[PDB]
Coordinates of C-alpha atoms and ligand atoms in Angstrom, one line a residue:
Chain A
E1 CA 0.1 -0.2 0.2
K2 CA 2.8 2.7 0.8
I3 CA 6.2 3.0 0.9
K4 CA 9.2 5.6 2.8
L5 CA 10.9 6.9 0.1
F6 CA 14.2 8.3 1.4
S7 CA 16.9 10.8 -1.1
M8 CA 21.1 10.9 0.0
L9 CA 23.5 13.0 -1.4
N10 CA 25.6 11.4 -4.2
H11 CA 28.7 11.5 -1.3
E12 CA 30.3 8.5 0.5
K13 CA 29.1 10.1 4.0
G14 CA 26.1 9.4 2.8
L15 CA 26.1 5.9 2.4
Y16 CA 28.8 6.3 5.6
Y17 CA 26.0 8.0 7.7
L18 CA 22.5 5.8 6.1
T19 CA 22.6 3.3 9.0
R20 CA 22.1 5.9 11.9
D21 CA 19.8 8.4 8.9
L22 CA 18.1 4.9 8.9
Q23 CA 18.1 4.1 12.6
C24 CA 16.1 8.1 13.2
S25 CA 14.1 7.5 10.4
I26 CA 12.7 3.7 10.9
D27 CA 12.9 0.8 12.9
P28 CA 15.6 -1.7 10.3
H29 CA 13.5 -4.9 11.6
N30 CA 11.4 -6.6 9.6
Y31 CA 12.1 -4.0 7.1
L32 CA 13.3 -3.8 3.0
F33 CA 15.9 -1.6 1.7
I34 CA 16.7 -0.7 -2.1
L35 CA 19.4 1.4 -2.6
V36 CA 19.7 2.3 -6.3
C37 CA 22.4 4.4 -6.8
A38 CA 23.5 6.8 -10.2
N39 CA 25.9 5.8 -13.2
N40 CA 29.2 4.6 -11.6
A41 CA 28.6 5.3 -8.2
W42 CA 30.3 2.9 -6.4
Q43 CA 33.7 3.7 -8.0
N44 CA 35.7 6.3 -6.0
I45 CA 34.6 4.1 -2.8
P46 CA 38.0 2.8 -1.4
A47 CA 38.3 -1.1 -1.3
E48 CA 39.4 -1.1 2.4
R49 CA 36.6 1.7 3.2
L50 CA 34.3 -0.5 1.2
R51 CA 34.7 -4.3 2.8
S52 CA 34.5 -2.5 6.7
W53 CA 31.1 -0.8 4.9
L54 CA 29.6 -4.3 4.1
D55 CA 30.6 -5.7 6.7
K56 CA 28.8 -3.0 9.1
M57 CA 25.8 -3.3 6.7
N58 CA 25.7 -7.5 7.2
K59 CA 26.5 -7.2 10.8
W60 CA 23.5 -4.2 10.8
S61 CA 21.0 -6.7 8.5
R62 CA 21.9 -9.6 11.2
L63 CA 21.1 -7.6 14.2
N64 CA 17.9 -5.6 12.8
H65 CA 16.9 -8.9 11.0
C66 CA 16.4 -6.1 7.7
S67 CA 17.1 -7.3 4.3
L68 CA 19.6 -4.8 2.3
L69 CA 18.9 -4.9 -1.7
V70 CA 22.0 -2.4 -3.4
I71 CA 21.5 -2.1 -8.1
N72 CA 24.8 0.2 -9.5
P73 CA 24.5 0.9 -12.8
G74 CA 28.5 0.5 -13.7
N75 CA 30.5 -1.1 -16.8
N76 CA 33.9 -0.7 -15.5
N77 CA 33.5 -3.0 -11.3
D78 CA 35.1 -6.1 -12.5
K79 CA 37.4 -5.5 -10.1
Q80 CA 34.4 -4.3 -7.8
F81 CA 33.0 -7.6 -8.6
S82 CA 36.1 -9.9 -7.4
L83 CA 35.5 -7.8 -4.5
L84 CA 32.2 -8.9 -3.9
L85 CA 33.6 -12.2 -4.2
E86 CA 36.4 -12.6 -1.8
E87 CA 33.5 -11.4 0.7
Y88 CA 31.0 -14.0 0.4
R89 CA 31.1 -14.5 4.1
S90 CA 29.0 -11.2 4.4
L91 CA 27.4 -11.5 1.4
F92 CA 24.8 -13.9 0.7
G93 CA 24.0 -13.2 -3.2
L94 CA 25.5 -11.5 -6.3
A95 CA 23.9 -10.9 -9.3
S96 CA 24.5 -9.5 -12.4
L97 CA 22.9 -8.3 -15.5
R98 CA 24.5 -7.6 -18.6
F99 CA 22.1 -5.9 -22.1
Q100 CA 22.5 -8.3 -24.7
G101 CA 20.3 -5.9 -27.7
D102 CA 17.7 -7.7 -26.9
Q103 CA 17.6 -9.8 -24.6
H104 CA 19.4 -9.4 -20.9
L105 CA 21.9 -12.7 -19.4
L106 CA 21.4 -12.7 -15.6
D107 CA 24.5 -14.4 -14.1
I108 CA 24.7 -15.3 -10.2
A109 CA 27.4 -16.2 -8.8
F110 CA 25.9 -17.2 -5.4
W111 CA 22.5 -16.9 -3.8
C112 CA 21.6 -17.9 0.3
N113 CA 17.8 -18.4 1.2
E114 CA 15.7 -20.7 3.3
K115 CA 15.5 -22.6 0.3
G116 CA 19.0 -24.1 -0.6
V117 CA 22.0 -22.7 -1.2
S118 CA 22.9 -22.3 -5.7
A119 CA 25.8 -20.8 -6.7
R120 CA 27.2 -20.0 -10.4
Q121 CA 23.9 -20.0 -12.6
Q122 CA 23.6 -18.6 -16.0
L123 CA 20.2 -17.2 -17.0
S124 CA 17.8 -15.2 -19.9
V125 CA 16.0 -12.0 -18.5
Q126 CA 13.7 -10.1 -21.0
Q127 CA 12.5 -6.8 -19.7
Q128 CA 8.4 -7.2 -22.1
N129 CA 6.5 -4.1 -21.4
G130 CA 8.2 -3.1 -18.6
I131 CA 8.3 -6.1 -16.7
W132 CA 11.2 -8.5 -15.9
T133 CA 10.1 -12.4 -16.8
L134 CA 12.5 -15.0 -17.5
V135 CA 12.7 -16.9 -20.7
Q136 CA 12.9 -20.3 -20.8
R137 CA 27.9 -18.9 -22.4
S138 CA 25.9 -20.6 -25.3
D139 CA 28.1 -18.9 -28.7
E140 CA 31.0 -18.1 -26.7
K141 CA 33.6 -20.4 -28.5
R142 CA 31.9 -19.1 -32.0
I143 CA 34.2 -16.9 -33.9
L144 CA 32.4 -14.4 -36.3
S145 CA 35.4 -12.8 -39.0
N146 CA 35.3 -11.0 -42.6
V147 CA 36.6 -12.9 -45.4
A148 CA 39.9 -10.3 -45.8
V149 CA 40.9 -10.7 -42.6
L150 CA 41.5 -14.4 -43.5
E151 CA 42.8 -13.4 -47.1
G152 CA 41.1 -16.7 -48.6
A153 CA 41.9 -18.8 -45.5
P154 CA 38.9 -21.2 -45.0
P155 CA 37.4 -21.7 -42.0
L156 CA 40.0 -22.6 -38.9
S157 CA 37.2 -23.9 -37.3
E158 CA 33.7 -25.5 -36.5
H159 CA 33.4 -22.2 -35.0
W160 CA 34.0 -20.2 -37.6
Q161 CA 32.2 -17.8 -39.6
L162 CA 33.0 -15.5 -42.6
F163 CA 31.3 -12.7 -44.2
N164 CA 31.5 -10.9 -47.6
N165 CA 31.8 -6.7 -45.9
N166 CA 31.2 -5.4 -42.3
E167 CA 27.4 -4.7 -42.8
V168 CA 26.1 -8.4 -42.9
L169 CA 28.6 -9.5 -40.0
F170 CA 27.0 -6.2 -38.1
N171 CA 23.6 -7.3 -38.9
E172 CA 24.8 -11.1 -37.6
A173 CA 26.6 -10.0 -34.3
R174 CA 23.6 -8.4 -33.2
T175 CA 21.6 -12.0 -33.1
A176 CA 25.0 -13.8 -31.1
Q177 CA 25.4 -12.9 -27.9
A178 CA 29.4 -14.1 -26.9
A179 CA 30.9 -14.9 -30.6
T180 CA 34.1 -12.9 -31.1
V181 CA 33.3 -11.1 -33.8
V182 CA 36.3 -9.9 -35.7
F183 CA 36.2 -6.5 -39.0
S184 CA 38.2 -5.8 -41.8
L185 CA 39.8 -2.4 -42.4
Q186 CA 40.5 -1.6 -46.2
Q187 CA 40.3 2.2 -46.6
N188 CA 40.0 5.8 -44.6
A189 CA 36.3 5.8 -45.4
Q190 CA 35.4 2.6 -43.3
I191 CA 36.8 4.6 -39.8
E192 CA 33.5 5.9 -39.1
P193 CA 30.8 3.5 -39.6
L194 CA 33.1 0.9 -38.7
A195 CA 33.4 2.7 -35.7
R196 CA 29.8 3.7 -35.8
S197 CA 28.6 0.0 -35.4
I198 CA 31.1 -0.9 -33.2
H199 CA 29.7 1.1 -30.7
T200 CA 26.2 -0.2 -31.0
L201 CA 28.0 -3.4 -30.4
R202 CA 28.9 -2.2 -27.1
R203 CA 25.5 -0.3 -26.3
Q204 CA 23.3 -3.4 -27.8
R205 CA 26.1 -6.1 -26.4
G206 CA 28.0 -5.8 -23.3
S207 CA 30.9 -6.6 -22.4
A208 CA 30.8 -10.8 -22.9
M209 CA 30.5 -10.0 -26.7
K210 CA 34.7 -9.8 -28.0
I211 CA 34.8 -6.9 -30.6
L212 CA 37.8 -6.6 -33.1
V213 CA 39.0 -4.8 -35.9
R214 CA 42.0 -6.3 -38.3
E215 CA 43.7 -4.2 -40.2
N216 CA 44.6 -5.1 -44.1
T217 CA 45.6 -2.1 -45.3
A218 CA 48.0 0.6 -43.8
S219 CA 44.6 3.2 -43.6
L220 CA 44.5 3.8 -39.7
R221 CA 46.4 6.2 -37.5
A222 CA 46.5 6.6 -33.7
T223 CA 43.4 9.2 -33.6
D224 CA 41.1 6.5 -35.6
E225 CA 43.1 3.2 -33.3
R226 CA 41.6 5.1 -29.9
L227 CA 38.1 6.1 -31.4
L228 CA 37.4 2.7 -32.5
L229 CA 38.9 1.8 -28.7
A230 CA 36.6 4.2 -27.2
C231 CA 33.8 2.7 -29.6
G232 CA 34.1 -0.8 -27.5
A233 CA 36.3 -2.6 -29.9
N234 CA 39.1 -5.0 -27.9
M235 CA 41.7 -3.9 -29.9
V236 CA 42.6 -2.9 -33.4
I237 CA 45.4 -5.6 -35.4
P238 CA 48.5 -4.1 -36.7
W239 CA 48.3 -4.4 -40.2
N240 CA 51.9 -5.6 -40.1
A241 CA 51.6 -8.5 -38.3
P242 CA 50.8 -11.6 -39.9
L243 CA 47.6 -13.7 -40.3
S244 CA 48.9 -16.0 -37.1
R245 CA 48.9 -13.2 -34.9
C246 CA 46.0 -11.5 -35.9
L247 CA 44.4 -14.7 -34.5
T248 CA 46.2 -15.5 -31.5
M249 CA 45.1 -11.7 -30.5
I250 CA 41.5 -13.5 -31.2
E251 CA 42.7 -15.8 -28.4
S252 CA 43.7 -13.7 -26.2
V253 CA 40.5 -12.0 -25.5
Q254 CA 39.1 -14.9 -25.2
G255 CA 37.4 -15.4 -21.8
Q256 CA 37.7 -11.6 -21.0
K257 CA 35.2 -9.0 -20.7
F258 CA 35.3 -5.0 -22.2
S259 CA 35.0 -3.2 -18.8
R260 CA 35.5 0.2 -20.4
Chain B
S1 CA 26.8 -19.7 10.4
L2 CA 28.4 -23.1 7.9
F3 CA 31.1 -22.4 5.8
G4 CA 30.3 -25.7 4.7
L5 CA 27.9 -29.2 4.7
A6 CA 29.0 -32.5 3.7
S7 CA 27.2 -36.0 4.1
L8 CA 28.8 -39.1 3.5
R9 CA 25.8 -42.5 3.4
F10 CA 26.7 -45.4 3.2
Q11 CA 26.0 -47.4 -0.3
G12 CA 26.5 -50.7 -0.1
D13 CA 30.5 -51.0 -2.3
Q14 CA 30.8 -47.3 -2.2
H15 CA 30.0 -44.4 -0.2
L16 CA 28.2 -41.3 -1.5
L17 CA 29.2 -37.6 -0.8
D18 CA 26.6 -34.7 -0.7
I19 CA 27.6 -31.4 -0.3
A20 CA 24.7 -29.0 0.1
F21 CA 26.8 -26.3 -0.2
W22 CA 30.7 -25.4 0.7
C23 CA 32.7 -22.1 1.3
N24 CA 36.5 -21.6 0.3
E25 CA 39.1 -19.4 -0.1
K26 CA 39.1 -20.2 -3.4
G27 CA 35.3 -20.3 -4.0
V28 CA 32.2 -21.4 -3.0
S29 CA 30.6 -25.0 -4.7
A30 CA 26.8 -26.1 -4.0
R31 CA 25.3 -29.1 -4.7
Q32 CA 27.9 -31.8 -5.6
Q33 CA 27.1 -35.1 -5.4
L34 CA 30.6 -37.7 -6.1
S35 CA 31.5 -41.1 -4.9
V36 CA 34.1 -42.2 -3.1
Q37 CA 35.7 -45.6 -1.9
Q38 CA 37.3 -46.6 1.2
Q39 CA 40.3 -48.5 -0.8
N40 CA 42.7 -50.2 2.4
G41 CA 41.3 -47.5 4.5
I42 CA 41.7 -45.3 2.2
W43 CA 38.8 -42.3 0.9
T44 CA 39.3 -41.9 -2.6
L45 CA 37.4 -40.0 -5.3
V46 CA 36.3 -42.5 -7.9
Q47 CA 37.1 -41.5 -11.4
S48 CA 40.3 -39.1 -33.7
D49 CA 43.0 -36.6 -34.3
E50 CA 41.9 -36.2 -37.8
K51 CA 41.3 -32.2 -37.3
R52 CA 44.2 -31.3 -34.8
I53 CA 47.4 -30.1 -36.4
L54 CA 51.0 -30.3 -35.0
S55 CA 53.5 -28.5 -36.5
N56 CA 56.7 -26.4 -35.4
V57 CA 56.7 -23.4 -33.8
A58 CA 58.7 -21.3 -36.4
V59 CA 56.1 -22.4 -39.6
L60 CA 54.0 -20.3 -38.0
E61 CA 57.2 -18.3 -38.1
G62 CA 56.8 -18.3 -34.4
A63 CA 53.0 -16.9 -33.9
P64 CA 50.9 -19.2 -31.1
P65 CA 48.8 -21.7 -32.5
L66 CA 45.9 -21.0 -35.0
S67 CA 43.1 -22.5 -33.2
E68 CA 42.7 -24.8 -30.5
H69 CA 43.3 -28.0 -32.8
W70 CA 46.9 -26.5 -34.0
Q71 CA 49.5 -27.6 -31.5
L72 CA 52.9 -25.7 -31.8
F73 CA 56.4 -27.5 -31.0
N74 CA 60.1 -25.8 -30.5
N75 CA 62.0 -27.9 -32.8
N76 CA 61.2 -30.9 -35.2
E77 CA 62.4 -33.0 -32.7
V78 CA 60.0 -32.6 -30.0
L79 CA 57.1 -32.8 -33.0
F80 CA 58.6 -36.3 -34.7
Ligands
C2E1 N1 53.7 10.6 -46.0 C1 52.8 11.0 -45.5 N2 51.9 12.2 -45.7 C2 50.9 12.5 -45.1 C3 50.8 12.4 -43.8 N3 49.6 13.3 -43.5 C4 48.7 14.2 -44.9 N4 50.0 13.5 -45.4 C5 49.9 14.3 -47.0 O1 48.8 15.4 -47.0 C6 48.0 15.0 -47.7 C7 46.7 15.3 -47.1 O2 46.1 14.7 -46.2 P1 45.2 15.0 -45.3 O3 45.4 16.5 -44.6 O4 45.9 14.6 -43.5 O5 44.1 14.1 -44.8 C8 44.2 12.2 -45.3 C9 43.6 11.9 -44.4 O6 42.5 12.3 -43.9 C10 43.6 10.4 -45.5 N5 44.2 9.4 -45.2 C11 45.5 9.6 -46.4 N6 46.0 8.4 -45.6 C12 45.2 8.0 -44.9 C13 46.1 7.1 -43.9 O7 46.9 5.7 -43.9 N7 45.6 6.4 -42.6 C14 44.5 7.9 -42.5 N8 44.3 7.7 -40.8 N9 43.6 8.4 -43.0 C15 44.5 8.6 -44.0 O8 42.9 11.1 -46.7 C16 43.1 12.6 -46.6 C17 44.0 13.0 -47.3 O9 45.1 12.1 -47.7 P2 46.2 11.4 -48.8 O10 45.5 11.5 -50.1 O11 47.3 10.8 -48.5 O12 47.5 13.0 -49.4 C18 48.1 13.2 -48.2 C19 49.7 13.4 -47.7 O13 49.9 13.6 -49.8 C20 51.6 11.9 -43.2 O14 51.5 11.1 -41.9 N10 52.8 11.0 -43.6
C2E2 N1 50.8 16.1 -37.0 C1 51.4 15.4 -38.3 N2 51.8 14.3 -37.9 C2 52.5 13.4 -38.6 C3 52.2 13.5 -39.7 N3 53.0 13.4 -41.2 C4 53.4 12.5 -39.3 N4 52.7 12.4 -38.5 C5 53.1 11.5 -37.5 O1 54.0 10.6 -38.0 C6 53.3 9.5 -37.5 C7 53.6 8.1 -38.3 O2 54.6 8.6 -39.5 P1 54.5 8.1 -40.8 O3 55.4 7.8 -41.9 O4 53.0 9.8 -41.1 O5 53.3 7.0 -40.3 C8 52.0 7.0 -40.4 C9 52.0 7.3 -42.3 O6 52.3 5.9 -43.1 C10 50.8 6.5 -42.8 N5 49.9 8.2 -43.0 C11 48.8 8.2 -42.0 N6 47.9 9.1 -42.3 C12 48.4 9.9 -43.9 C13 48.2 10.6 -45.4 O7 47.2 11.5 -45.0 N7 48.7 10.2 -45.3 C14 50.1 9.7 -46.1 N8 50.4 8.9 -46.7 N9 50.1 8.7 -45.4 C15 49.3 8.4 -43.9 O8 49.7 6.0 -41.5 C16 51.0 6.4 -40.9 C17 50.0 6.2 -38.9 O9 50.2 7.9 -39.1 P2 49.7 8.1 -37.1 O10 49.5 6.9 -36.5 O11 49.0 9.6 -37.3 O12 51.4 8.7 -36.4 C18 52.1 9.3 -37.3 C19 52.0 11.2 -37.1 O13 51.2 11.2 -35.7 C20 52.3 15.7 -40.1 O14 52.2 16.3 -41.5 N10 51.6 16.0 -39.2

């Protein structure tokens, strides 16, 4: 019927004082917290202070029998995610949501409740009319690349798909989730629209997808490479390196997430 | 209040080990089922190349393998 709405300053002191402020405001017994932080709000918090704050929050939750949920919109929280994993004792559930254009991927590192404990689950949830509904990793091994990248070479494995140009490649990568996308650069005119395609491939598709650009002709500058990196590409393969160097660079980004 | 819960049930010839959850500095596991055997008083856990490519590292001019089926060799003696 009713809930309490609370506003705090966008500062570390607000998070630090949250406990005392709510104690002065609300009796936390049988009461739920939903902390919706701003974009990259948990980026300025140091590791040790974050651990101490989490420990204090867990102790307060146990003492007051209150449950706390924190939703943090961020893109470079991999180190923070590792820190959360290291403090699994205080925590009792960690979930991440990755946007993949048409669907969202929910990864639960661990979860403990009255009905049991689950660890390392991966599920797909979609947003239908503003409602989050589960849909009842899969293409990580698959590699998508341009024909000109291989310089005529056939598909190196079953997980290899070749495309004539970097237009149908982007269309296929729209459907792919964790496949490795490799582009080909031939002239200067391809720098900008391929950059746009990479931007879309990093906005629609999260950090799970691997984006790579192979340079086949010496038509690149440092600024263009920086722009490609900023658009979401993991790295741009120089034209000087042979094809096998490109392939091992592709292998390097396997199992890696674009945290920038 | 538990960092790991395990049960060992006798099943005639081998024992079934069911871990509901387990915490460790290397990670946390949940709902593991394994089979162990007591051999002389010791609990022990129970237990084509057409596409694989073997080439020298100098075949790729020192570059790492193309794919999973590619395996490199420093000189043409380990490869042999
Ligand atoms: N050796 C050398 N000459 C240079 C360099 N920068 C400019 N020039 C000379 O200046 C002309 C104008 O280039 P821009 O104004 O930078 O405008 C350039 C630039 O925007 C682009 N472009 C040409 N080559 C490349 C390339 O290899 N990479 C990139 N990213 N853009 C290039 O096309 C335009 C026309 O350039 P060009 O037809 O080559 O004609 C070039 C070239 O004769 C340089 O770093 N090295
Ligand atoms: N401000 C300024 N810097 C200059 C100029 N000429 C060379 N540089 C600098 O020199 C670097 C490498 O020398 P490069 O032989 O031009 O190495 C160039 C060149 O071989 C080629 N290139 C790039 N743009 C052009 C262009 O417009 N024309 C031609 N012909 N080649 C270009 O691509 C390479 C990559 O260049 P970058 O990564 O941008 O890195 C370039 C750039 O920072 C110039 O007129 N003005």
